[PDB]
């Protein structure tokens, strides 16, 4: 089931999130200063999701921004480097603390080169999601039923994926390395917005 | 004496000269830690003098130096600490912390140039001239040549002054918090290199 | 329905074009000084098309060239950079003014890398066209029925595609950037014919 | 006085010296406008003298200079205006027009060479010698060095004469209309760069 | 139908070739000094082919070599640059004169990038051949029926392909350019054997 | 049929190997100092296999290590360069002597670019194996039935593949070159562990 | 007189000096024939003197020179004739034949080096020193500078001697027949370049 | 006499000077053995003198030299023997064994540098200066120039001393067994090059 919102999540539906917050975003493209934030989706892990539609030029969302900046509740992304930069560009908020399931996948799933959400979900959870609506118009006047289902499917399994990946990082001894990556991720995202988006700051160049 | 020479470990007396930040560099047999052994460790307190410590083959202990490296009350200054931190962890098992990297700081504030080596940084920021001719030499040699000893000392003699200059630039241009976060992740970046992620950015897609 | 012509469109069938002119060409290849113009197709947007067969060495087509140079009627291409250069190389005419639906696609469809006509037509218009006859012999002595249908299908939907893309450029605020691109397109095509065809003149090299 | 120094904006008296085309260049902290702030704006009327205007950090207004930049009755001469036009639009919100780019003109008529930088263009077309040693310096410095001031002025002192030489070449070789169309699209090319199309030709397939 | 021979074609079956000779070879690989010639197939254009099995170290084939060096009978290859070098390396014979249908394809079929035999045969002749046996062991003790059928299919249509391509080169005005290419082809092949196999001798380097 | 072992092969099941030993390994990835050895599989060529599960941090396996270092029994790998390095990294043993069927494939199957085990097995032996379980979690608490079947299938045909490839190396005269490659292979693997893993030591750089 | 200057075409008297092979080079406005016009044609009979012929813009006729170019009884010597043959065919419609290319000959017999330019070939084979500084100049200039005239003449003054030296090398190393076949295909190679195959080898798969 | 010249083969008297290892290099017409013929073979016993043997065109026999090359009781020292071993096998059919390659040894122990050429190795290990100017010359020349003869001799005069220096480094850094295995495979590596595997590592996946 999906709860649809315009502009911001209701304070009522924000209270359902008493722990970690699974979160994803939908934009018009991969360049934040060019392609505006259109949708942000949330899920508390109970099999339901909140889908919030963002309007052009909208620069505030009090209930959502409070959840994002809340240091007592962890935020779960799959490749948070992009979403953290977009949310900071749109609302000026620094999402923290974070768990990135793609960084976790790269650190423990060393036997494969597939670290996208789709391949992670079927190997670790035996869950099949579709990638058909990823390249659609997320700024449409009316989000299609398939678009709303795709957006929710991006957050409905992030809690369970994090738990399975965390057990792998424990088994293979890289949980501290992953924790250090999550602490730097907000800085990595802010460095992307400033023009270092295609260079590793820790390299020689 | 401008250069204090030590065999195996720094003396406790000279280790007491370091009441604050410690400038540090290393010399190895190459750029692969699991292949090329650590040969020299050079330190400087910033007063124009340096300690040069010769590391023997197969040596896995240096308690006086290792204590300074792990001491969270004294900051360690490197130029491209990503490599040296990895060599020190591979050799002694010590995680150097906390660190300041003048190369990361240079890439974050000297945005008008692509020259981020130590020689170029010392030339612009401090008008100091150093030569890099002895970097490709046998650092495991029987006896280190005098030219080798001066190159090793000159690699740490100006790191204090360079850090001060670059810190003022990061504060002026508003990226001191970005650099501090980079320094906190640097020991993890080095440990990921030792594990085989040395040629990939862990924060990228692939 | 398709109206076939040899050498030039009839003055009768040119009068059906009281507004924008959808236009495409078919050649023997992508190098204009090597591969001759074989077919030029037109459509006024009513669901019908004129298909004009061009003979080797033919250097004039009065009714068509008058339409191309007419500044009161807009010409619609999908990737006009190629067709404008070919028409200028064959007839010495500078087609103006132009609307390029591929430039428009690149400027507003920022969520995808597919900017060809086929993917544009199905997303924006839900229209499916075949690309089977694109790599055929367009200098054949008799154009096949499939060739004539492929040629017409390249212009039958350019009016409706332009309208949908224009609404997107309006919604996303890049209609002035697209208009500036269309004004430079004839110069970009002429620069290609002179040997700058593989370099961006606005770059350092 | 060969160099007129200004703080923040050009004086109204010196702005009156520009009755025709305005040669113009900028100095920044780097090549990324959203990261590297605008530091200096240099102008020259073509009489051998230059105005050098220091731009403060966070400054978003310069009415006397901005009026000259937007004035459609006076042409602005750049060398690679694609970058400067973007920096000026990002800093002041002004769309510089109309413009002449001696680099675009050089690439369109000097077809016998791949050297299209300003130094090479001034050497062949005018036999003028300029040095580029100070381009990689701190242009946000506390006080601009005299070598910095002369480099900044020399970047605009010859743009009038270079434009005249290249215009005669474009007329002779029959591509003045191609260059004029390139100049008309240049402000859009710069704005597309600021939006993230900076490393792609919008007129290509991909 | 296929006529099988060991070592050399019979003088009887060589007399069936009163005109152009379609010819192809099969080897153990693409490096002539490493991978030996295993099979050479011939066809006179009547729908039948001679398939000659070559033994290891065999350095003579009088009836075949006489056909190859015969200047009165044209030899047809598809990409003769390879086969001419192999035949010269094995028997010391310089095949001349030649018609290469791949060079002809590259010169007149300017609307496509597919210049292999398979795509040439279906577009120009509406003939479908299989490429399944191309990467098999041609030095096997017994050539399989599929291997013999694949080898013959490489020469059964070279006459008809040459005729259709020659008409295209005539129509598009590059028949003299193709003739000049065929005259240089034996030198191009000999230059390959000497180590210039990966550089264009007419370039700067 | 498959014989499962934990930690080491039983001395009873080691006595079944009176000749060459087919052997493969399964790891958590391709970097030995990062990805631990999980499984090593053996087969004597009778159609049955021993599958030994290796525990994390386990640094000894007496019965297996004795087989690996036994100079009187040849060890057969497909691409032994990787497995020899992993076994030397885990147990400190130098496997010798070895026959690598991938080196043999590259030296005699000169007509193809496919030198993996799957393509080698179907061409030379007409045997079809699946590659589905290659990218699985080999450090799982319980190896799946499909994982155990995949692991055994990697060694069940190495004897027969070696024999067929050895006959090809004899026929084409490169058996001495292959023998020289096998003698250097343990050094090539040890050079990989020391950081020369992406450079050919015999090149200029 | 070491350099004979001509406007438009070589005089009939000076054309009579060429009883055998003709060394020839051209100067253009660039490397794209359909964009960059032919400016100068230089010839030399091998006696230490050269004819330098200035080609006007839009000129499509030069009967005295064109006759020498098409004359199958006199061989034309180029260094990288692939380009010049294309420029001459595009400008005058003449197919230069027969030709000898000292660059193709150099690549076929000087197998011990990668330096196949004219300057390197003249240095090793003849110990002649020529400079290439004037190759990137305005050859359509109002008046050709004296340095331009000497560079143009020096490009043809030694082609006879270089051809003789390289021919003896091709005969010695057994590749004179390979070079002769390359020379016979060269006019077709140039015409394929003018048609858009300029960046592909027609004898390759793609 | 510092250089002993021979035509076709080394004399039996001078071949008797080699009681131990034989330093050896070759000069060819290029880097492709099947195209570029062997021209010179240079040997040195390590006493400061060298034998320089001119190889005629089409020559396929040199019994005195070939016996030294195949002699398993005397080691042959090359710098990058991979090429010379291939040229010798292609020319005479001899498999040179056993061999020591100072380049392979340099890449295995001089891990602090990327400069593994002979000139750089002689400069660091022995402080000997040699020039490489004559490597790109006509070694099939009518008469070898004196500069050619000295370059050829200097390529073998120091291989004994260089091998001794590098052997001590391999023993010190623990990779003498790796180098010995590389030397044993080297003749096979060269023969694979002659068969068309010259641009691929046979030990890689592809
Ligand atoms: Mn998503
Ligand atoms: Mn996402
Ligand atoms: Mn360092
Ligand atoms: Mn250092
Ligand atoms: Mn079309
Ligand atoms: Mn089109
Ligand atoms: Mn500028
Ligand atoms: Mn400037
Ligand atoms: Mn075939
Ligand atoms: Mn073939
Ligand atoms: Mn396996
Ligand atoms: Mn394996
Ligand atoms: Mn030339
Ligand atoms: Mn020239
Ligand atoms: Mn050598
Ligand atoms: Mn040499």
Residue numbers in the entry:
A (entry chain A), C (entry chain A), E (entry chain A), F (entry chain A): 4 to 208
B (entry chain B), D (entry chain B), G (entry chain B), H (entry chain B): 3 to 208
Q: What do the authors say?
A:
The Agrobacterium tumefaciens genome contains two homologues of RNase D, Atu1151 (denoted At_RND, 30% similarity with full-length Ec_RND) and Atu4108 (denoted At_NrnC, 31% similarity with the N-terminal 184 residues of Ec_RND). At_RND contains an exonuclease domain and two HRDC domains, whereas At_NrnC contains a single DEDDy domain. At_NrnC forms an octameric hollow cylindrical structure, which allows dsDNA, ssDNA, and ssRNA to enter the central tunnel where the multiple active sites perform hydrolysis. This novel structural feature accounts for the high processivity of At_NrnC and its preference for longer dsDNA substrates despite the lack of HRDC domains.
The crystal structure of apo-At_NrnC was determined at 1.5 Å resolution and those of two forms of At_NrnC-Mn2+ were determined at 2.5 Å and 2.3 Å resolution. Metal binding was found to exert only a minor influence on the overall structure of At_NrnC. Based on the arrangement registered on the active pocket, we considered one of the metal-bound structures to represent an inactive state and the other an active state. In addition, nuclease assays indicated that Tyr153 is essential for At_NrnC function. Indeed, in the structure of the active state, Tyr153 was located at the typical catalytic site for DEDDy enzymes. In the active pocket, Asp27 and Asp86 coordinated one Mn2+, while Glu29 and Asp157 coordinated the other Mn2+. The distance between the two Mn2+ ions was 6.5 Å in the inactive state and 3.9 Å in the active state. According to the superposition, the two Mn2+ ions were located on two sides of the DNA backbone, which is similar to the case of Mg2+ and Zn2+ in the Klenow fragment structure.
